Scaffold this motif. Structure first.
Motif, PDB file in Angstrom:
ATOM      1  N   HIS A   2      11.927  -7.571   5.106  1.00 12.96           N
ATOM      2  CA  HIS A   2      12.731  -7.235   3.880  1.00 12.96           C
ATOM      3  C   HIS A   2      12.123  -5.872   2.966  1.00 12.96           C
ATOM      4  O   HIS A   2      11.326  -5.577   3.371  1.00 12.96           O
ATOM      5  CB  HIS A   2      12.755  -8.404   3.149  1.00 12.96           C
ATOM      6  N   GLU A   3      12.996  -5.576   2.114  1.00 18.07           N
ATOM      7  CA  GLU A   3      12.806  -4.399   1.296  1.00 18.07           C
ATOM      8  C   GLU A   3      12.484  -4.868  -0.232  1.00 18.07           C
ATOM      9  O   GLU A   3      13.171  -5.817  -0.541  1.00 18.07           O
ATOM     10  CB  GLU A   3      13.583  -3.281   1.207  1.00 18.07           C
ATOM     11  N   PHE A   4      11.476  -4.389  -0.853  1.00 14.56           N
ATOM     12  CA  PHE A   4      11.462  -4.763  -2.254  1.00 14.56           C
ATOM     13  C   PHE A   4      12.469  -3.977  -3.140  1.00 14.56           C
ATOM     14  O   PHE A   4      12.970  -2.726  -3.005  1.00 14.56           O
ATOM     15  CB  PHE A   4      10.030  -4.020  -3.025  1.00 14.56           C
ATOM     16  N   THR A   5      13.097  -5.075  -3.940  1.00 14.74           N
ATOM     17  CA  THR A   5      13.759  -4.101  -4.836  1.00 14.74           C
ATOM     18  C   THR A   5      12.955  -2.923  -5.576  1.00 14.74           C
ATOM     19  O   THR A   5      11.719  -2.974  -5.620  1.00 14.74           O
ATOM     20  CB  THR A   5      14.070  -5.080  -6.358  1.00 14.74           C
ATOM     21  N   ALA A   6      13.484  -2.094  -5.865  1.00 19.09           N
ATOM     22  CA  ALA A   6      12.862  -0.676  -6.365  1.00 19.09           C
ATOM     23  C   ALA A   6      12.074  -1.042  -7.913  1.00 19.09           C
ATOM     24  O   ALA A   6      10.909  -0.631  -7.878  1.00 19.09           O
ATOM     25  CB  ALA A   6      13.781   0.578  -6.795  1.00 19.09           C
ATOM     26  N   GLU A   7      12.608  -2.001  -8.796  1.00 22.18           N
ATOM     27  CA  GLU A   7      11.667  -2.227  -9.729  1.00 22.18           C
ATOM     28  C   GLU A   7      10.490  -3.001  -9.416  1.00 22.18           C
ATOM     29  O   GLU A   7       9.329  -2.248  -9.797  1.00 22.18           O
ATOM     30  CB  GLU A   7      12.804  -3.143 -10.654  1.00 22.18           C
ATOM     31  N   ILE A   8      10.556  -3.843  -8.562  1.00 21.64           N
ATOM     32  CA  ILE A   8       9.197  -4.693  -8.241  1.00 21.64           C
ATOM     33  C   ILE A   8       7.989  -3.650  -7.484  1.00 21.64           C
ATOM     34  O   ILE A   8       7.140  -3.692  -7.780  1.00 21.64           O
ATOM     35  CB  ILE A   8       9.450  -5.841  -7.246  1.00 21.64           C
ATOM     36  N   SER A   9       8.731  -2.823  -6.750  1.00 16.76           N
ATOM     37  CA  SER A   9       8.101  -1.868  -5.919  1.00 16.76           C
ATOM     38  C   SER A   9       7.273  -0.916  -6.925  1.00 16.76           C
ATOM     39  O   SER A   9       6.105  -0.578  -6.801  1.00 16.76           O
ATOM     40  CB  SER A   9       9.012  -1.062  -5.165  1.00 16.76           C
ATOM     41  N   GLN A  10       7.969  -0.652  -8.227  1.00 12.38           N
ATOM     42  CA  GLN A  10       7.329   0.441  -9.087  1.00 12.38           C
ATOM     43  C   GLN A  10       6.525  -0.496 -10.149  1.00 12.38           C
ATOM     44  O   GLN A  10       5.253   0.076 -10.379  1.00 12.38           O
ATOM     45  CB  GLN A  10       8.476   0.968 -10.062  1.00 12.38           C
ATOM     46  N   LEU A  11       6.570  -1.752 -10.318  1.00 12.41           N
ATOM     47  CA  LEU A  11       5.502  -2.647 -11.038  1.00 12.41           C
ATOM     48  C   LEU A  11       4.312  -2.687 -10.273  1.00 12.41           C
ATOM     49  O   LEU A  11       3.095  -2.919 -10.675  1.00 12.41           O
ATOM     50  CB  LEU A  11       6.364  -4.037 -11.306  1.00 12.41           C
ATOM     51  N   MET A  12       4.673  -2.887  -8.782  1.00 15.50           N
ATOM     52  CA  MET A  12       3.525  -3.189  -7.953  1.00 15.50           C
ATOM     53  C   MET A  12       2.690  -1.753  -7.777  1.00 15.50           C
ATOM     54  O   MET A  12       1.515  -1.879  -7.653  1.00 15.50           O
ATOM     55  CB  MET A  12       3.915  -3.102  -6.485  1.00 15.50           C
ATOM     56  N   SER A  13       3.179  -0.489  -7.892  1.00 20.68           N
ATOM     57  CA  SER A  13       2.414   0.690  -8.071  1.00 20.68           C
ATOM     58  C   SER A  13       1.961   0.957  -9.609  1.00 20.68           C
ATOM     59  O   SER A  13       0.664   1.527  -9.217  1.00 20.68           O
ATOM     60  CB  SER A  13       3.526   1.803  -7.520  1.00 20.68           C
ATOM     61  N   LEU A  14       2.473   0.590 -10.419  1.00 21.28           N
ATOM     62  CA  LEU A  14       1.789   0.700 -11.731  1.00 21.28           C
ATOM     63  C   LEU A  14       0.657  -0.074 -11.913  1.00 21.28           C
ATOM     64  O   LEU A  14      -0.418   0.605 -12.135  1.00 21.28           O
ATOM     65  CB  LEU A  14       3.086   0.279 -12.658  1.00 21.28           C
ATOM     66  N   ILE A  15       0.710  -1.274 -11.475  1.00 26.81           N
ATOM     67  CA  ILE A  15      -0.342  -2.340 -11.372  1.00 26.81           C
ATOM     68  C   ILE A  15      -1.529  -1.886 -10.667  1.00 26.81           C
ATOM     69  O   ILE A  15      -2.688  -1.859 -10.936  1.00 26.81           O
ATOM     70  CB  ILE A  15      -0.075  -3.678 -11.680  1.00 26.81           C
TER      71      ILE A  15
END
Ligand SMILES: Nc1ncnc2c1ncn2[C@@H]1O[C@H](COP(=O)(O)OP(=O)(O)NP(=O)(O)O)[C@@H](O)[C@H]1O
Length: 213
Positions: A5-18
């Motif tokens: 599956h693919e991450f929602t773009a928001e979650i992916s950005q939260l994952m990269s931020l943290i």
């Protein structure tokens, strides 16, 4: 049989931020994950008031922390309500958008990363100390699955044919960053729990391998 599956773009950005943030008190990830585990236990506790047979899959109610120094892995297991396959696909990836937008905005205004749980996305605090994570889960009346992410753009969900049976509940396997191996240490783990998790309705168990001499 590995569903991608693919991450929602928001979650992916939260994952990269943290996973990138330079933050001093990275130990607060442990409060967040014990707090999830406590919540998941609350939920099986509720169902068992109405229907006591729900607890028969794993009668003891616990949170258990399992340092795996061989693999540079810290495991956090609860005997909570657990998660279905569809639960994993939506609760992790494919959702949570509300809290993540609010939280990214609070951070730009000066918010302390330790306030991530007030927005209910504290799970992702795990990337303060890890770059890879597996989530293993088993809901009563459904099979055991494992969900996996590299903080990237895809995540898998697959039926669990390689791990110990949970009985019921959820186990997070953090692949710790190389600067963060202190969290494999019995003393270190003891400090953070007593410091940040004094009011937990359930026993927090630490698993220590000790050589007999
Ligand atoms: N240890 C766990 N056991 C069972 N379900 C979990 C666990 N951790 C996370 N989840 C599920 O995955 C979601 C993601 O966690 P998080 O983003 O920290 O949400 P939350 O709304 O703060 N958690 P809660 O209050 O525990 O329902 C949760 O809402 C749960 O539905």
């Amino acid at each position: 049989k590995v569903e991608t599956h693919e991450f929602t773009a928001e979650i992916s950005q939260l994952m990269s931020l943290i996973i990138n943030t330079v933050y001093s008190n990275k130990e607060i990830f442990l409060r967040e994950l014990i707090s999830n585990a406590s919540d998941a236990l609350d939920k099986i506790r509720y169902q068992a008031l109405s229907d006591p047979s729900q607890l028969e899959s794993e009668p003891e109610l616990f949170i258990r922390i399992i340092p795996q120094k061989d693999q540079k892995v810290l495991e956090i297991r609860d005997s909570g309500i657990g998660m279905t396959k569809a639960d994993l696909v939506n609760n992790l990836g494919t959702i949570a958008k509300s809290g993540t937008k609010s939280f990214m905005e609070a951070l730009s205004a000066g918010a302390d990363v330790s306030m991530i749980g007030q927005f209910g996305v504290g799970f992702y605090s795990l990337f303060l100390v890890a770059d890879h994570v597996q989530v293993i889960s088993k809901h009563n009346d459904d099979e055991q699955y494992v969900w996996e992410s590299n903080a990237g753009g895809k995540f898998t969900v697959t039926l669990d044919e390689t791990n110990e049976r949970l009985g019921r509940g959820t186990m997070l396997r953090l692949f710790l960053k190389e600067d963060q191996l202190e969290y494999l240490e019995e003393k270190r783990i003891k400090e953070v729990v007593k410091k940040h998790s004094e009011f937990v309705a359930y026993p927090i168990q630490l698993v220590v391998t000790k050589e007999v001499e």
